[PDB]
Design a protein around this ligand. Sequence first.
Ligand code: NA
Ligand code: NA
Length: 691
Amino acid sequence: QEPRTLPPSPNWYCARCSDAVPGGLFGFAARTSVFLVRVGPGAGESPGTPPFRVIGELVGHTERVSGFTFSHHPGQYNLCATSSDDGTVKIWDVETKTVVTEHALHQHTISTLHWSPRVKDLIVSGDEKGVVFCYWFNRNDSQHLFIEPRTIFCLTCSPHHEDLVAIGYKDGIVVIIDISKKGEVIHRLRGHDDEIHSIAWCPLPGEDCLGCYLATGSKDQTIRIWSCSRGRGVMILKLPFLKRRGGGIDPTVKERLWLTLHWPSNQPTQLVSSCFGGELLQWDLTQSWRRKYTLFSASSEGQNHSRIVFNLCPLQTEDDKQLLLSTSMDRDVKCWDIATLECSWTLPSLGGFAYSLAFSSVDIGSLAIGVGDGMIRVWNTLSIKNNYDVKNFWQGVKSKVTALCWHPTKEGCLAFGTDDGKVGLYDTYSNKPPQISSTYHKKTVYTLAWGPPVPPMSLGGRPSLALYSCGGEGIVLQHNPWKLSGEAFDINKLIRDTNSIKYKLPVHTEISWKADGKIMALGNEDGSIEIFQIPNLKLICTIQQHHKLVNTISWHHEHGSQPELSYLMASGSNNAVIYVHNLKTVIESSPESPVTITEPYRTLSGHTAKITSVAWSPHHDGRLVSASYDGTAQVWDALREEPLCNFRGHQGRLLCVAWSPLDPDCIYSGADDFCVHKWLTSMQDHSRPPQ
Ligand code: NA
Ligand code: NA
C-alpha cells in the first residue's frame, strides 16, 4: 503493498493550524497545503498496525497555511476552512479536495480562524492588525469588526452562545466580544502578561461544574480559568518545572514555550495542556489551589514529544476511542488515548526538501533520507507493526543533507554530504556523533560512492573501500574512512598522471562505480561521461551524448537473467532526454587508447525538464525509473524504449528515486515538496509524463 506518504511538517507557531472531526479525520497545515489523515477503523489497517492513513491533501494556497478549522456540524464534517499568508480564507470540501468558495477580505497577515460551533456556515478570522472578519460562506455575507489595535494570536467561538467569541492577543489581552453588537467587548479578562496561545471554553455551560468558564494559556507559563459571568479569574495554574526525558535534543536550537489547551467534553473537570519540552499534562481542576497534574505517558519512556507542542485536536473514533492528536516542533504528530494517557502512534514528518534516498544492502529495507532540515532520517521500511518507523540523526549534520550512501558491507556505516561541502560518516548503531572529513568541498556535495582505493591511498601501509565525494565545484575526493580527519585526495591528480593529460580536466558533477568495483564513471559539467579502470583510473571510454551537465549515472545490477545487463549504464542530465549505453564491448576489449562513443544504446524521451536521478529495478531486466523537475517519476522498459508508468503524486520537483528492495511494484521518491512517497507501479494510470 500500500502507498505511504512521509509528509511535510505541521506548521509551527500557529494557534490553530490543525483540527479533527469524529470517525474520523485529522487535518494539518504543512507549508502551503493541508494534509489529511484518516484515523480509526476507516483507515483499514491490519490489527496491531496503527489505524491511520495519510489519504489526501488540500492544494491551492500559494503561501504558508496559517489556520485550519473543520466544521463540527453533523452532516458537514467534510467541510473545513483555511487561512493563509496569501491573503485568502478558503472553504473546502474534503470529499472532493476542492474549494467551495473563498474570500480575500483581509488586508493584513491573517493570524487564525475558527468555524463556529453554533452557526453552520460562520467562519471567524482575525489578523495581525486586529481586524476580524465574520464570514457566512453559504449566504454570501460578511462583516468586519475591529476590537482593539493589537495583534491577534488566537480566537475561539463559544460552543454555547452563537454571538460570543474569545480573542487573545500578542500582548496578553483577552476579550470576549459579541459579534451581533459590532464586536462590543463584553468581558475584558486581565491577568496575562505575554502572548496568548490558546483559548478553550468549558464544554459544559454554567459555572456550577468546577454563565460559562473559559481557559487561557500563555507564553507567561500560566493557564487561567475565568468566570465569563463575572469577567474575573477563578483559578491560576502555573506550569511545573520538570526534568527532560527521552533522547537528547540539539541544545543550539532556539525554543520558547507554546502553551496550548484542550478541554475534554467527557471529562469537564479536567484540562489538558502542553508544557516545556512538549510534555502534555492533564490538570485536575477540582483541586484548583493544589495544582494537581498528571504527565501523559508517565509510566513509559521514549513516547513523549521532545520539543514544544503547538496544537491539540480531539478525535472520537467510530469504535469509540477518545483520541487526541498533538503537533510539535519535534516534527512528529502523536496520537494519544485520553482514557489511558498513552501514546497510540507517531507519524514523523519532514521540514525540508528530500534530497537523497539510499537503501542499505546490509539491513534490507533500511532507507536513509537526506533532508533540508538538518536531520538524516532512517526509515525501517520493513517494520512489521509500524508503517512509519523513522529514527532521526542530528548530531554533526547542522545543514542540508544533499547526499547519502550506506557502506556496502559494514552495518550502520552511513556516509553523508551537505550543502556546505561537508562529508561525514555516521555509525547509526551508536549514539555517537559522526566523524567529519577535515577536507570540505567548496560547494554542495552532490554524490557519495564507495569504491576500491586508488593511489596514493591504495599504496600506503588501508580499508577495503574508500569513500568518494563529488562537490558542485567539480572535484572528486577520495577519503580514507579510517583517517577522516587526515588527508583526502583529489583524484584528478591521478587521472592526469595516469592518462598523460595536458589540458584542464573537466568539472565532475557525478560519480558512479560499477557494481563489480572495477570501473568508475564520472559525469561532467559539459555533458561527457568518462569511464575509468582500476587500479590507476586509466581512461578507456568517453561518452559524448548529453549536451548539458550530468546529474545521475546508474549501472544495471548483476543479478539479471543475462550477465551482459551489468554493462548497461543509464544517465540523466539537465536536458530531459535519458540515455542508456552498453559498455560491454569497450570494457571487455580493455583498449590501450580510449574509445569515444557518440550514439546511445537506447534513448528514453518523454520528460519535459531536467533529470535528477535514475535507478534500475533490482527485480527486473532493464527496467528504469527516472525522477524529474517536471514533477513526475517515470518507469521505463529501457530495453524496448517503452514508457510504462508515470507517478504524479508529488507537487514538487523530484530530486531522488529508489526501488523498494523486496517489492517489484514499489518505488520511493523524494522532492522539493518536503515529501517522500512510496507508490505502486500497478496503481499508476498514466503511462508517460504530461506533454
Ligand atoms: Na485582501
Ligand atoms: Na503532481
